Amino acid sequence: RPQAPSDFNPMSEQSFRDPASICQRAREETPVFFYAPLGVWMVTRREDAERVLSEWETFSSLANSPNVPEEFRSRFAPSVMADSIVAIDPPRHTQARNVIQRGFMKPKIDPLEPIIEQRAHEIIDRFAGESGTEIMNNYCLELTTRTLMALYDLPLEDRPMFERIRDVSIKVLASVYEPMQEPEKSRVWNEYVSGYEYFYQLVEQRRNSDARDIISTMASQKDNQGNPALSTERIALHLVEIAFAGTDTTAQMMANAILFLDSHPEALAAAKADKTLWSRVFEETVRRRPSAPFAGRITTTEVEIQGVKIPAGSPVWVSLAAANTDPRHVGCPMNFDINREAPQDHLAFTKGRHTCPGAPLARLQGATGLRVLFERLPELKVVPDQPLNFAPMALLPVRLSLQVIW
Amino acid sequence: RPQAPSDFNPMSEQSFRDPASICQRAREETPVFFYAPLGVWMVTRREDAERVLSEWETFSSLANSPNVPEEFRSRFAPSVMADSIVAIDPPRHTQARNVIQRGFMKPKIDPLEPIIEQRAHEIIDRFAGESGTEIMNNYCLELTTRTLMALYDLPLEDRPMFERIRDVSIKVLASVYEPMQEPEKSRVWNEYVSGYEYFYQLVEQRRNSDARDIISTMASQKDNQGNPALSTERIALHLVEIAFAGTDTTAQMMANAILFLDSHPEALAAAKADKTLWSRVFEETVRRRPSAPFAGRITTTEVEIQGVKIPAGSPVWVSLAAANTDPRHVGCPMNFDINREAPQDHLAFTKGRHTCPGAPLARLQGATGLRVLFERLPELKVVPDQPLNFAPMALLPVRLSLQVIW
Ligand code: HEM
Numbered sequence A, B: 001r002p003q004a005p006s007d008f009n010p011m012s013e014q015s016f017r018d019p020a021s022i023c024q025r026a027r028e029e030t031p032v033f034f035y036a037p038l039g040v041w042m043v044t045r046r047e048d049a050e051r052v053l054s055e056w057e058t059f060s061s062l063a064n065s066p067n068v069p070e071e072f073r074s075r076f077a078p079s080v081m082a083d084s085i086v087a088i089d090p091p092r093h094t095q096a097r098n099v100i101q102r103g104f105m106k107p108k109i110d111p112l113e114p115i116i117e118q119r120a121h122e123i124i125d126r127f128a129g130e131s132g133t134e135i136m137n138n139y140c141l142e143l144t145t146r147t148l149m150a151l152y153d154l155p156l157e158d159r160p161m162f163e164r165i166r167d168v169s170i171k172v173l174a175s176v177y178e179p180m181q182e183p184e185k186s187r188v189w190n191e192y193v194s195g196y197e198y199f200y201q202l203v204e205q206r207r208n209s210d211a212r213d214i215i216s217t218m219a220s221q222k223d224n225q226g227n228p229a230l231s232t233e234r235i236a237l238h239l240v241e242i243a244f245a246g247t248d249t250t251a252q253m254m255a256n257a258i259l260f261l262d263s264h265p266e267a268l269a270a271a272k273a274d275k276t277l278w279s280r281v282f283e284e285t286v287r288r289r290p291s292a293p294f295a296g297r298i299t300t301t302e303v304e305i306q307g308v309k310i311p312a313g314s315p316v317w318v319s320l321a322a323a324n325t326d327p328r329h330v331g332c333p334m335n336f337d338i339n340r341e342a343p344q345d346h347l348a349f350t351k352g353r354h355t356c357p358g359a360p361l362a363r364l365q366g367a368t369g370l371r372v373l374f375e376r377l378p379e380l381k382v383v384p385d386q387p388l389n390f391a392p393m394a395l396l397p398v399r400l401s402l403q404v405i406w
């Protein structure tokens, strides 16, 4: 069975600095292969990438499934966890999506730009009088958390718990891989269920609310028969998943955009002169360095990709970094050129049913934050020679530190 | 059942000149309704538009299906016609699409730009010395036919039949509603089958060819077991369908782009000054005036759209003009502003499985021809007050004449 080139290692620091650098030789030489250290098939070319991400009937998304402990099944039934937005397919995934996507529409997200700018200025006021700061937790992650809280429309008193909402979730994801012992398992799962019940109560209270918050936007969705389009359990679980899935991705996006603007100062000045380039500064970043460089699916039958035969039930990962940097679709795929004619023509948000629903917000945040970040501290320059601090993760390399000065 | 505002009439001249003008009041007031003069459901909002265009499992494409005459079934079996790319759904549509998409990739389409530019200059040289011309057939339609012949890589000696390929096919489409009488039916269907057999022979001869032309690109697709991925009959039928679906659409795109550049001289000057804007001149045109302003589907079960319940088996049309001009997705939806940040964020090529596969070519053609047209004849001005000549059709309003001067 086909193997992988030597330079292809998603767990190396070379992947943490540039996920697409390890994928060029692989895509060129072995477009579809098998990765044994992860035990999954690997697809790199954009054609096959879009095929796998689109054909849901052939490449299902059932690959992820946490298990609920026994003592919490009275408050959080296992079917609720089985209704995870990442672990469902039509007709259930479409039923959940028709409600989830209703909250990220332009009339709902556009009125958040002034709030994002205001809170970003408030955050910058905390360290604007110094000479340098750790921009990751102090700005990027902080601004993402505040933007998600504004989308949820939650008071600052609930800010701690909301942060915990992501810290718990990742641990839950690791449970199938590094099982938790007691009393860590009970504590983590109880905090998870507590956040779930908090969102449950918020949905029950905002069930007939006609406001901008995603809770009221998803709760007020009633079918022709008056019945709620999504049960309260499903809405609460999807709110938890949205909170946990947006924060790290958007924070990594902002960090990578800061890095790219530091490595390309002329594009930074050009973007400082015209605001309409900021979105492009977004789009070229997430294309060149996607926050989630891997998208997982599972085959429902036997497939043939690039002549390689893949048996039924085989987990297949699409390397979004290889697809976004395919020379067969974009000229100079490794360059950071914000002046491309088709900026949003990438798979950084995948494609099809499981397309990233938080893309309208993230973009706006990326368009709003970076500008403000380069409007308050213009000579912001990423400190060279700072030890790379990355959480060793394959699907989502999270940067823990990024020292910047101005 | 909900009706439509008075101004909504797809068969009126107001729709032929601007398909989005009849859709604004409808989209705002009655987003999903029933049109009795056509007997079909109408969906206008972009939110529901993407769902209907994407959810193939709920909104199938089986609504269109011509019937094969009896005497030609020995040369053109009815199952071959049943394998029409517009009348199939997964798993057959995926099998056909995996082969069709291989011919429109960037490495295949990009080497056609210089040929398109050269042939556009050759065409302009025929009438550049006059003072005015009918730009539709002399340039738009001519350039589209020559571009399709270059994609097929056919000699000019094959120009007549190829032209006939468009004249015949539409009549076949008109058979399901306005049946043909004798002896025209036999002659037209024999010409259709003759073109089908010509493409069959071209596929058999280019079966082992490794060139860029769509015939060799689709014919050389063989699975891991050496067998052809698609039978020769289906490849020939798909070539016929590709020509017939590209010609009129790209010609109407170019005509509408000429009209929009005439109505906005500052954008025309900006595009003349910078080549990178020509593509945007494309994208803003096809957004403001899509060549095919309606996309048809058929429901497989009962659906709920905007609270309106639509029974199973109901033909539903998505008004692409209303979706591309939805104020819920784009600000100032009726203006022709080529300086938008997200130019390709429209449904002019729909979305999902049945997305227009010729979009890479059309764009390339639209950017290449028009530019040359405004590089040879810069002071081109569309003659005001000329009787609008449109073939009275709902799914594809084709303009028959457009007099221009310079
Ligand atoms: C620039 C930042 C972001 C990037 C690069 C990004 C990227 C992605 C990727 C790669 C996926 C996987 C899709 C798949 O597996 O097919 C995804 C899904 C998802 N994203 Fe994001 N995302 C970002 C921001 C956000 C935000 C801000 C939110 C919410 C506020 C969000 C919520 C979600 C959800 C809920 C899913 C699951 C969709 C589903 O499975 O149905 N994302 N995103």
Ligand code: HEM
Binding pocket: B053, B061, B085, B086, B097, B241, B242, B243, B245, B246, B247, B249, B250, B253, B286, B290, B291, B292, B295, B296, B347, B348, B349, B350, B351, B353, B354, B355, B356, B357, B358, B359, B361, B362, B363
């Ligand atoms: C800007 C110019 C064009 C426009 C506006 C346009 C419009 C469209 C639209 C809206 C669809 C979607 C039909 C559906 O959803 O079922 C479509 C399908 C299609 N288009 Fe185009 N088109 C254009 C140019 C072309 C070109 C140059 C080709 C060359 C091959 C082409 C070939 C096709 C084919 C074969 C289909 C059927 C796809 C399928 O059903 O699988 N079109 N066209």
